Design an enzyme around this catalytic site. Sequence first.
Site, PDB file in Angstrom:
ATOM      1  N   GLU C  59      -4.003   7.487 -75.457  1.00  0.00           N
ATOM      2  CA  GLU C  59      -5.205   6.690 -75.620  1.00  0.00           C
ATOM      3  C   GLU C  59      -6.387   7.549 -75.165  1.00  0.00           C
ATOM      4  O   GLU C  59      -7.440   7.541 -75.789  1.00  0.00           O
ATOM      5  CB  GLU C  59      -5.108   5.376 -74.816  1.00  0.00           C
ATOM      6  CG  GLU C  59      -6.292   4.430 -75.008  1.00  0.00           C
ATOM      7  CD  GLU C  59      -6.151   3.097 -74.284  1.00  0.00           C
ATOM      8  OE1 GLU C  59      -5.173   2.939 -73.509  1.00  0.00           O
ATOM      9  OE2 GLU C  59      -7.030   2.205 -74.501  1.00  0.00           O
TER      10      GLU C  59
HETATM   11 MG   LIG Z   1      -9.484   0.161 -76.191  1.00  0.00          MG
END
Ligand SMILES: [Mg+2]
Lengths: 591, 585, 153
Positions: C59
């Site tokens: 991420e």
């Molecule tokens: Mg996010």
Amino acid sequence: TEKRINVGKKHLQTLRNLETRCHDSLQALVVIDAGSSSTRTNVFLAKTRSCPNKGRSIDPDSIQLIGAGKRFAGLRVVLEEWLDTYAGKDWESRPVDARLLFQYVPQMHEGAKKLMQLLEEDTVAILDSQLNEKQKVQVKALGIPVMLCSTAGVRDFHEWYRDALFVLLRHLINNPSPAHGYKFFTNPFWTRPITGAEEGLFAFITLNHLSRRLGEDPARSMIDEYGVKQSRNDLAGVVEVGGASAQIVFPLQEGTVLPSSVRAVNLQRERLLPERYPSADVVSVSFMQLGMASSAGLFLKELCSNDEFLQGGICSNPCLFKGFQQSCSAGEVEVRPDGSASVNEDVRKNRLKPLATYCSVNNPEISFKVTNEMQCRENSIDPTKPLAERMKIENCSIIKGTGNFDKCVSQVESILVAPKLPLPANIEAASSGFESVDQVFRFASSTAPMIVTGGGMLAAINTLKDHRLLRSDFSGDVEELAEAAREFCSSEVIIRTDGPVIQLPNARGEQKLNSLNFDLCKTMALTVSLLRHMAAGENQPSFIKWEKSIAGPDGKPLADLGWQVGVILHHVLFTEEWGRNAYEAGYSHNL
Amino acid sequence: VGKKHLQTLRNLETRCHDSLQALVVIDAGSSSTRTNVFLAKTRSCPNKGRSIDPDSIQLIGAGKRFAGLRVVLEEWLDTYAGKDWESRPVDARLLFQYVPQMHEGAKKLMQLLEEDTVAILDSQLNEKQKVQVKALGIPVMLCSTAGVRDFHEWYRDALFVLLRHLINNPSPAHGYKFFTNPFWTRPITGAEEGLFAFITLNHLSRRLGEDPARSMIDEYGVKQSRNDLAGVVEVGGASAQIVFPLQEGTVLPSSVRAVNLQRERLLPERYPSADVVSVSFMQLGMASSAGLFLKELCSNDEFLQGGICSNPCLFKGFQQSCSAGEVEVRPDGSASVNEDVRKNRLKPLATYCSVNNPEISFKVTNEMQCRENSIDPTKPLAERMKIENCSIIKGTGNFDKCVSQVESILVAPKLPLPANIEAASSGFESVDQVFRFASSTAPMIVTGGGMLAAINTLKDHRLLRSDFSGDVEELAEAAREFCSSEVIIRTDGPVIQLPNARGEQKLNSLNFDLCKTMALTVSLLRHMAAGENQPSFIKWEKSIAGPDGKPLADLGWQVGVILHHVLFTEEWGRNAYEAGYSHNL
Amino acid sequence: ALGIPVMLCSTAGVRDFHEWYRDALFVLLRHLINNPSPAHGYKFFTNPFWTRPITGAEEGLFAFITLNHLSRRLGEDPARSMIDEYGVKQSRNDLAGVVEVGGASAQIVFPLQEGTVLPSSVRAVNLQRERLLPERYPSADVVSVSFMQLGMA
Ligand SMILES: [Mg+2]
Ligand SMILES: Nc1ncnc2c1ncn2[C@@H]1O[C@H](COP(=O)(O)OP(=O)(O)NP(=O)(O)O)[C@@H](O)[C@H]1O
Ligand SMILES: Nc1ncnc2c1ncn2[C@@H]1O[C@H](COP(=O)(O)OP(=O)(O)NP(=O)(O)O)[C@@H](O)[C@H]1O
Ligand SMILES: [Mg+2]
Ligand SMILES: [Mg+2]
């Protein structure tokens, strides 16, 4: 001092850089030119780069010649010497059963061994002399690829003998003397006969590489709006006249509609260059008999068996100077100090030997193929006669020079450049869609600039320049050349105390006549003819130049023009295939 | 004759040529640093480069056991960080000025290793073989395992830089051309140590391969293995690995992180795939567990009573000084304990648990893990390793108590045993949890000298069946009887005397606490048996019989690491042959 | 005509989810993505590499990639790269790090200035080595860490 530390922190990054980046190393590359006139090495150096997880490859712009070797026996000699002994003297005139010569393979080997030992030693001598001790370490370590390629001298060779030889040659290259420590090796892709068209294409590649016209980077390429890589400058064509053959090569201006018979080569499609290089369709054709030596013998045979020129024993030659005269044969001419011309009758040194040998009725190529017999006869070789006869110029005692350039030109035109039938041993050229030099520019033509190469061709222009008959800035104007040549070839030959001298008209000066320049007018005619056909093409080359080598980025040339560099580039440029053969397999394969 | 002479020569230049290559894996394990010298058959083919026949890989010499890398580093730190850095704040940026000296110390170790390798090569190879081996170069893979996995600050990775430079400058006199690079020579993670061992096992037992003999491409285009790939358990000096492939389509908890062999680049695409659980536990090795077990047992009241620690894992009649120091069983039947800190089996763990190791200093959870195993990070080293209020350890030879102590101390601890962030991140804190979370019908092979001696000993005394298949309760029985033995000193030294007039064997430095390992085995088999899936069978092995009959190599991670590199043919050809030793110029 | 790749990636909201439920869901999600309504004519599809839970570090790394791509700091051409004397491709400008605070987690990502000596415990990601970017792009070792509970909510 708490900088004893800063030095440690560097010590580590120094070492880290080392194991994370690419390392450069020097490699030797040997191209042995097994051309018609001789066999000789060319020793190249190149910078190799190995990178983590990426293997090793050669920087192509780093390729540079470091030595051109001594000129030893051509491969024809080796083979014909072999045949003399084991097929019996004068196999050129008798049916020889070829299956019988298989029992003499070992001896072919033996004879080949003699030649190769010279070549090896000569290479090693060049390496030892040119490389410092540090360079030697890198070179001995990496192995030394050897590319030995036969051209026109043996292209026409009959039966299976030539390919058998190459088997033995490769085995010989792959067993180098361990004493010198250079680890030579080869394989059947590197060491082989090269076709006329390849001989052309490699020369084309050399030229455009050295002149920095051809490359893959943004300096020499643009990727166009439509995703196709173009070259920034125009690729240039080449004309190379060798000993036995001449090559004509040029790229076609894009989208030229060709006749279906004209078979052009696409560089990518035909695996000449890798996909990441710009592409082009290029015409490449090679003509047997068009080389200096080949053309010389054939020209004499054809001229001096024509009535216009032979009259009661005397052959009047428009391509030789007034005052020059020589015995009537195609044998090698030595211009002696006393101004006489001595002609060697030794068959081997006779410039008709190749063509006469090919035209044997006992060569299956003629024996079964009438069209080839017809080609021989049309050039005054009778296949049914024994060799001596075949090469003999009938009813001719002496050749006298008449020094008439224009007649010389039109004789070169009908004999060499635009013959009735194709000159013999040219099935290759013909299958491309070209029988004669004439047809090349009639069928395909290109605005691509052309560079003319070859000792002869260059000497022709230089001579006329030297005597101020041509502009220093000569651009390729045919009529200008024809003028200079006309004046020059008019020259009278005068014997003096200091030997034979070529004396120019209108008290314009002089120069010594020797074994190399005595018939140079023929080559001037050849040049004129060839430029005329060019100028007649639908497209005409943007310009024309004569060159021996190309000035490197430094200023000094990195290598000679020719096919040598080209053949290296053809192999090393396919980095994955080359890495596999040159480094993975390498010399260690030979164990 | 001539017509053949030509085809002979033609075949030569058109076909592949075989050549022998040497491969060196140097095991930089906890207990020592040692070479393993392998031979392999390479094949070069026109336009195809060169590669290794993996089935031809065979060990030809295991080297002498020299100093582990911990020794080198701690010996370095003693001199340049000052004596007893284990108990003081040491400013790490200062030790950069002593890089050259680290090099120097490493050089000493590597010279021994190089010489030893060379000795093995010279002795095993005939003159013809030597030529091929010296010509092709010799890849060296030096991989450190648990012995230094826990090492603090930047020292370990600095050391590896220097090691590689040393491997890459071999003595020119012997002519063998060693070389390495940062992919071959490096610390290997616990899971890698597991996976390679897994690879070794299945390779040698010919369970794992790419051909039709060991593979089937199924109706749906997926390559399967014909026999089930087998899991492995390896108990080393400092750590133990548990590895097993999952029966296909096992739904795992999101926290359990299994490795896919293709996805994770362990094996090339052309081999069968599998998702495999591979976890390694620090402190679970023979030496590590030995020291930790004592510290924990002998600071528990159930076992320590007024200076005497009653150990259920030691024989009745055996007794020893109370420390984790190395035990020598003397000829006169006493047990001598070496107080030299370096030879003390708590040294690794005690060193890791320094309050001055940033790993503890900033990470309370690591502090807690230390304290839970009776290491107090704030105390100086000597104290940390000292077993408090304890003079002697007496054996009580009670197997079941031994088992349940191994259970709570080692196999199913409250907190994870220290220095196991790796295991934990996979989703496993303890050995306990491995079989609770993932489990597989994959048969399991148990490896490691200790583990083997455990079963062999019970076998030798006819307490176990020759054909022992892994039945836990049968093992618990044999171990119960055996560990009941009384130790008797005789003229011929200390003797382990079995109950019910069952025979005997000499007590020595290797077998004196072997009952612990029997308990470890029993515990481990119990957890296995409790798993949702249970292994189709269990066996104990040291090496695998080759096609010949004799073994080609040892079990372990050595063959695996070779296979992990050489199997990627294009990458290997590039590194081993194209770059090769000539890179070092 | 060309088809429409779909990448559905779960982040912090379900990163912490217990038992096997989250991965079972993704199986079903992918089968659902791969059976789009034929009526609209857009040909959606996916596979288990595109559609999956992404780790905190991923991420982070993807966000890092986005930033440096969009700001034209990261690329492979001569505009954004130099091959150095020693054959290593460098970026011409410095790659920039990112800090992203989401709903449930925050990411901190930054490339290390080259040759930073890290503690053995600090595990930095190499972009090439870890298959984040292809070999022809410049490399970097980058720290990427994601913290549950640090998001706004
Ligand atoms: Mg996010
Ligand atoms: N300056 C010069 N003037 C006249 N003739 C020359 C000159 N230099 C070379 N030659 C001749 O031209 C030929 C040189 O070409 P060369 O390329 O060496 O032949 P080759 O490569 O052996 N034959 P090929 O098989 O066609 O490549 C020789 O036959 C020489 O006799
Ligand atoms: N037959 C045996 N009986 C009891 N103990 C043994 C036996 N053989 C070996 N050992 C012990 O078990 C260990 C051998 O494992 P070994 O794999 O050599 O350690 P290592 O590889 O250096 N450490 P690691 O980092 O975990 O791989 C040594 O510490 C020995 O003391
Ligand atoms: Mg030539
Ligand atoms: Mg080990």
